[PDB]
From a paper:
The spectraplakin family protein GAS2 was originally identified as a growth arrest-specific protein, and recent studies have revealed its involvement in multiple cellular processes. The GAS2 family cross-links F-actin and MTs, which is essential for the regulation of axon morphology, cell apoptosis, and cell division. Notably, the GAS2 protein is the most diminutive spectraplakin, comprising a single type 3 CH domain and a GAR domain connected by a hinge linker (H-Linker, first panel).
To further investigate the interaction between GAS2 and MT, we used the GAS2-GAR domain construct to elucidate the GAR structure bound to microtubules by single-particle cryo-EM analysis. The density map reveals that the GAR domain is inserted into the tubulin intradimer groove. The β4-β5 loop forms a hairpin structure (G-hairpin) and penetrates into the groove of α-β tubulin intradimer. Specifically, GAS2 R242 potentially engages in a salt bridge with α-tubulin E411. Similarly, GAS2 β4 R252’s proximity to β-tubulin D199 implies a potential salt bridge consistent with the observed density. Furthermore, α-tubulin H11’-W407, Y408, V409, and G410 form a hydrophobic pocket, into which GAR domain β5 W257 snugly fits into this pocket alongside α-tubulin W407. While in our study, we observed that GAS2-GAR-decorated MTs displayed a dimer rise of 82.25 Å, indicating a 1.7 Å reduction.
Numbering used by the authors:
A (entry chain C): 1 to 439
B (entry chain A): 202 to 273
C (entry chain B): 1 to 44, 47 to 360, 369 to 436
Write the structure that this text describes.
Amino acid sequence: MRECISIHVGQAGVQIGNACWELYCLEHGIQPDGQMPSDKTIGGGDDSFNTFFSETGAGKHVPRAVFVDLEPTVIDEVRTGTYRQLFHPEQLITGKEDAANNYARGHYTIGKEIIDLVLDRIRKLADQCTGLQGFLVFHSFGGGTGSGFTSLLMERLSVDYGKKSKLEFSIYPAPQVSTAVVEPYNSILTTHTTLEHSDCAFMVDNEAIYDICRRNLDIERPTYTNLNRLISQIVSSITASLRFDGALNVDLTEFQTNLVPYPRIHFPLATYAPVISAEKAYHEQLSVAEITNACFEPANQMVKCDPRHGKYMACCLLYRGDVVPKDVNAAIATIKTKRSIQFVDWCPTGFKVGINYQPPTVVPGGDLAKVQRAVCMLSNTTAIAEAWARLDHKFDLMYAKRAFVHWYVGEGMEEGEFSEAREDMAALEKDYEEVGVDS
Amino acid sequence: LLDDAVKRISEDPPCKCPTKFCVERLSQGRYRVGEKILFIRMLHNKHVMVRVGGGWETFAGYLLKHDPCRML
Amino acid sequence: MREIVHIQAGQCGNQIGAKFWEVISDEHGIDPTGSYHGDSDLQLERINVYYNEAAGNKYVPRAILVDLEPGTMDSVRSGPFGQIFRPDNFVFGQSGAGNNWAKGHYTEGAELVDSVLDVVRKESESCDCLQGFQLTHSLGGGTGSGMGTLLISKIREEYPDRIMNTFSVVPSPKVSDTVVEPYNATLSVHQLVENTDETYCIDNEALYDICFRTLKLTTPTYGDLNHLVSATMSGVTTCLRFPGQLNADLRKLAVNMVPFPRLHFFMPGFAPLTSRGSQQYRALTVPELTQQMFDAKNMMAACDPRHGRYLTVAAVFRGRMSMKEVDEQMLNVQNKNSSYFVEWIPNNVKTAVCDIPPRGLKMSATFIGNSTAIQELFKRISEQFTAMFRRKAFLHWYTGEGMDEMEFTEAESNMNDLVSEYQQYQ
Ligand SMILES: Nc1nc2c(ncn2[C@@H]2O[C@H](COP(=O)(O)OP(=O)(O)OP(=O)(O)O)[C@@H](O)[C@H]2O)c(=O)[nH]1
Ligand SMILES: Nc1nc2c(ncn2[C@@H]2O[C@H](COP(=O)(O)OP(=O)(O)OP(=O)(O)O)[C@@H](O)[C@H]2O)c(=O)[nH]1
Ligand SMILES: [Mg+2]
Ligand SMILES: [Mg+2]
Ligand SMILES: [Zn+2]
């Protein structure tokens, strides 16, 4: 019904954004040149696309994206790839050189030269909106641009707009899998900014999605196109109720205020259920009950922690497709009655439910079966605290002897900022463990 | 601006050499510390850094390896 | 955009740089005249990293070729791919440094450093934004190690924010035909610690061993040793020339691998090294590459990582590869070789994957490992230096051209400090 702006930051954000837009345009029937053939549309008009596209050009749709990177390369791949014709070029922002995995570059030394341009481009996109819902930020905590420039951009958004929601789809460093030596410095240094300047952070880690690709899709050699496709399905499901009519629809703002029990306790674990191998999809009936049951298994979580080490504060289930509301209540009752699934006792209900009539669409590539029912769970749990403790432990192991700190300090950072971001993380740990106590 | 802080940090601990160890300025950002034109940085809390070797060092920590009279 | 300028100092520098320009132009499909005859637009998309566009669809490499003696200019110019450099970057002396660091740093190199700085300037504003200099040189004599290092002093003195890379061929005890190598190496490493962002130590003994027991060549010429270091030079810089699924950059490798500013000496390795026959008896697979990169026989320095502890590692892969494979192989190596990686760094590997592989191979990898194994080579150089220096052997050659007995003592204390600082991390 309303519209929101997506900001894709750094290489992970930009690459995830490519798949997300390949999914949206294919879901709305929009071709890679931005045209959309005149369908039947009995009644007059199609407001499905307005949430993510502007109509300007008499049959031309332009997406409400900003792509930003301190590095040209991946933006030049988008300017060259199949979807190069969607974005009007002024919104594909680009720096001269990257942060190069250094937060202090992407925040202090180098980000400050590109912020004045992206702020102008989002102020220009927001004025085109009749009513703004929120901001969808795609980034990664381990990168320099992703971590530092997104942290800076979040404080700029919070100052300029204030009360507009800001969803944040962040890639988190995996427990063991890690492609950079310095990820823990960049991922503690985001944390203050994601606490203070964000409303919902859906952290997702790559070794969890590799396990989903191995266990569920039978993919032997998965690559980032498959992983980014799974994030794109999460993001499409979260905003499905804003684009299509449903039996029980949930607004983005009402969805947060349902799921966030306290202002700081705002870090939902994301999940998607009917994700199975294109052959094994013949052998499964794929009804509501078993896709609800998939959402609560540790193997289906998009972060490497298992919920049995904690308690759910809240869940929401965003069902879409051919889901009858009477089945959902039975599935929720079964989940509540089933043990080994722990909810904190001071939330009696513990669930928000959303039902949408649009079934998920499948892009060409054969990674996924065409299924008539899907659910995205996302859930707020004190089990997330273990991912951050195992990471803050890695940060301490290095910081105990200043192991790379000269690269950050020399890029205009006081060494007290490391200790501040570290004790802030620890305070968030204590906040998440104290709400682990049943009253 | 930083010229006052670069002066201050060089001689709050006084130079004890028989000829004073050089910390003159040519212009902004270019200091001939000990007959070598370093590149100098600061931003906040007056933390002052030199671009050296594989990365960066503090201006005081640099002198603590480069003027013989700072060693003892 | 994101340009690099290449500098060759001495015969070793000149000969490595020649083979380096050979392999680069082969990668980009550049006619020895300077024309383009490739079949992909990705090469044109970053041809400007190492080349300048000239009229008539002609490309000139962004290189300078320097030494105090004119014999290697004629060879490089008349040799293969010789008529591609504009005949103004060749700036040569007339006497030579005679394997003496004094001639390189004070008497002959000092009178030619202006003529090379004026060409490095002329190359520096011809680019959108260069990010670093690559110096190719030997630590054997003045030539590369004193002239080509006065050069990095002056370059750092005027371009401090940029990256300095030096592919320093370090001397080895079992290969030398110079008797003054301990003096020249010790004097060179004295300033190389201050003036460089990252230094790749190579020695010819390891490149000979790799030819003898990995490529199965019984008579390896310098044309063959130079192939390996040129393939390393291409591998370490291939990320900013071709699209990749994960990206490195020179500044990326600097912050991921230099933990403390002094600890920037690195040992390369290259993964798909195979004999022309035995290549069909082996898999083109990431597990095989990854295990080969960590083999103590495959390192391009005579020190083995076995006696030391890895501080940081970079592995830049080239080819149509899957990150899950690299990630599990990296964990495999770090877990079952855990005694060989430092404990106070949890993750020691930095990964990059590039979609365009070297010619002729499906997959390749360049390894760069910072380790406390590098300091034993420096201990051997310091032992050879102090054996000659206590007798003041050959000292008159350097003394009569500018140094005093103080400078040698300063160099030996500061190289002793470098080995003390590397062994501090066990
Ligand atoms: N899921 C996912 N992770 C990715 C992708 N590309 C990179 N990553 C991971 O994201 C993290 C940060 O990498 P980048 O996104 O390259 O970093 P950046 O934000 O561009 O920042 P700099 O390059 O350091 O300026 C690393 O852990 C990467 O492995 C991708 O397409 N999908
Ligand atoms: N890897 C490699 N090493 C070489 C090559 N040619 C020579 N060397 C090494 O480097 C030394 C040559 O000295 P250089 O400084 O390069 O050049 P030069 O012109 O001989 O210097 P001077 O004559 O002393 O002025 C030899 O003793 C070898 O140790 C080569 O092509 N490749
Ligand atoms: Mg980019
Ligand atoms: Mg010569
Ligand atoms: Zn002094």
